[PDB]
Amino acid sequence: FGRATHVVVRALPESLAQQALRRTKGDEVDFARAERQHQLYVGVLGSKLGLQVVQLPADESLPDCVFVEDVAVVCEETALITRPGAPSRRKEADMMKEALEKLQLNIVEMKDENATLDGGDVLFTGREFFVGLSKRTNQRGAEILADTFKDYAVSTVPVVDALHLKSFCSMAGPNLIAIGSSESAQKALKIMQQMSDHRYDKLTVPDDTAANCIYLNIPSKGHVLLHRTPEEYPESAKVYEKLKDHMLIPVSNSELEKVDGLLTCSSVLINK
Ligand SMILES: N[C@@H](CCS)C(=O)O
Numbered sequence: 001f002g003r004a005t006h007v008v009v010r011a012l013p014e015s016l017a018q019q020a021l022r023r024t025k026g027d028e029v030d031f032a033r034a035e036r037q038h039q040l041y042v043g044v045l046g047s048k049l050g051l052q053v054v055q056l057p058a059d060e061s062l063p064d065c066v067f068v069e070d071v072a073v074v075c076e077e078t079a080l081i082t083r084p085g086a087p088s089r090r091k092e093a094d095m096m097k098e099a100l101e102k103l104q105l106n107i108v109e110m111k112d113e114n115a116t117l118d119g120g121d122v123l124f125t126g127r128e129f130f131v132g133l134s135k136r137t138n139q140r141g142a143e144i145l146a147d148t149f150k151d152y153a154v155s156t157v158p159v160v161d162a163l164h165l166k167s168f169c170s171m172a173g174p175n176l177i178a179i180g181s182s183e184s185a186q187k188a189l190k191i192m193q194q195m196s197d198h199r200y201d202k203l204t205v206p207d208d209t210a211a212n213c214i215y216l217n218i219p220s221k222g223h224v225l226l227h228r229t230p231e232e233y234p235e236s237a238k239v240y241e242k243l244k245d246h247m248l249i250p251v252s253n254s255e256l257e258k259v260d261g262l263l264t265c266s267s268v269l270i271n272k
Pocket residue numbers: 020021022064067070086089120259260261262265
C-alpha cells in the first residue's frame with residue numbers, strides 16, 4: 001500500500017483562474033501563484049521522491065483539467081476511466097485514457113450514460129473502497145466501480161456540504177485515515193467505520209480540507225506525507241508536525257483550493 005513508480009499530472013490552463021468550477025466565490029485565483037504551487041508539487045513527486053512523471057498538456061477548453069484525480073481511479077494494474085459528474089470535465093477523460101494505456105494498465109471505461117463518478121469521491125484504503133455519493137458521483141457510478149474492482153469491498157458514504165468525499169479525508173498511512181472535525185466529516189467517518197469490519201486508526205485535524213494529504217511509501221525514504229502548510233492551516237499543521245513516523249513535506253495548495261482542488265486532486269499515482 002502506498003507504493004508508486006509513476007504519476008500522471010496535467011498543466012494548469014490559463015482559463016482555470018476565472019472559469020474553473022467552484023462552490024464558493026471568495027478570493028480570486030492568482031494564476032501565477034497557482035502555477036508556482038503546481039511546480040513545487042510536481043517537483044517533489046518527480047525529483048525528491050523519484051517518481052516517473054507524465055506531464056499532460058493543458059487544454060484551455062477544459063478549465064479544470066489539472067485535477068486529474070477525478071478522471072481515473074487506479075487499483076493495482078487496472079484503471080477505471082470515470083465519467084465525471086460535471087459535463088464540462090467529460091473530455092478530460094480522453095487524454096487520461098491515452099496516458100494510462102501507454103503506462104500499460106488494463107483500462108475499463110465508465111460508459112453508462114446514467115452513471116457519473118469523480119475519482120475524488122473514491123477513498124481506497126488498500127483494504128477496501130469507500131465511495132462518496134455526492135453531486136458528482138451517483139449510485140450507478142459507485143456500482144460500476146464495485147463491478148470494476150471485484151476483489152475489493154466497496155461501500156458508499158453520503159457527501160454533504162463538500163465537493164468530494166476526499167474534500168475532508170484521505171489516507172495518511174497503511175491503517176491511518178486523516179479526517180476533518182466538521183459535523184459532516186465526522187458523520188461520514190462514523191458511517192465508514194460502521195460499514196467496514198476493519199478498525200482504522202484516525203489522524204484528526206481541525207480544518208476539513210487539511211485532512212487531504214498524499215501518503216507514499218518510497219524506498220530509501222520510507223513513509224512520506226505531503227500535507228498542507230503551517231501558513232495555510234496552522235492548527236492542522238501542528239497535528240501533522242507531531243508525526244515522527246513519516247517524512248513530512250509541507251506543500252502549499254492555497255490557489256487551487258479556491259477552486260476546491262486539494263492535494264490528492266492534482267495527481268493519479270500508479271505502481272508498475
Ligand atoms: N474545480 C474542480 C475541482 C476538482 S477537485 C471541480 O469542480 O471539479
